[PDB]
């Protein structure tokens, strides 16, 4: 159902190329966020409040299989890594992940460790 990434109250921070940051949540899979060569390419969503998070899609437009992890937090200091695909070699257009029942968080952080990362969209579904 509802895509929290596109809620007005949701803010987004990126480790590079801030000019393209809103491309992560504009509802258009072909508008991309393409990070530069920083060692830790990362995106953090602040949902503004602690919310139910049921599922997450990452639309990956680059050539290489995406290597990534997903972390969540309530206070923004203590993080729980809920998906760890840093060694992934599977090549998919969309990397979907369904969360355990009852997962909540205010912050959702995405770390990308592959090459040619180009993210068309990140969708964070509440139930
Ligand atoms: Ca987009």
Residue numbers in the entry: 1495 to 1621
Structure paper excerpt:
Overall, the presence of at least three functional CBMs in CpGH89, with a fourth likely, imparts diversity in the ability of this enzyme to recognize carbohydrate substructures and potential for increased affinity through multivalent interactions.
Overall, the enzyme comprises a glycoside hydrolase family 89 (GH89) catalytic module, four FIVAR (found in various molecular architectures) modules, an unknown module, a C-terminal fibronectin type III-like (FN3-like) module, and six putative carbohydrate-binding modules (CBMs). CBMs are presently classified into over 60 amino acid sequenced based families; the CBMs from CpGH89 all belong to CBM family 32, which is one of the most diverse CBM families.
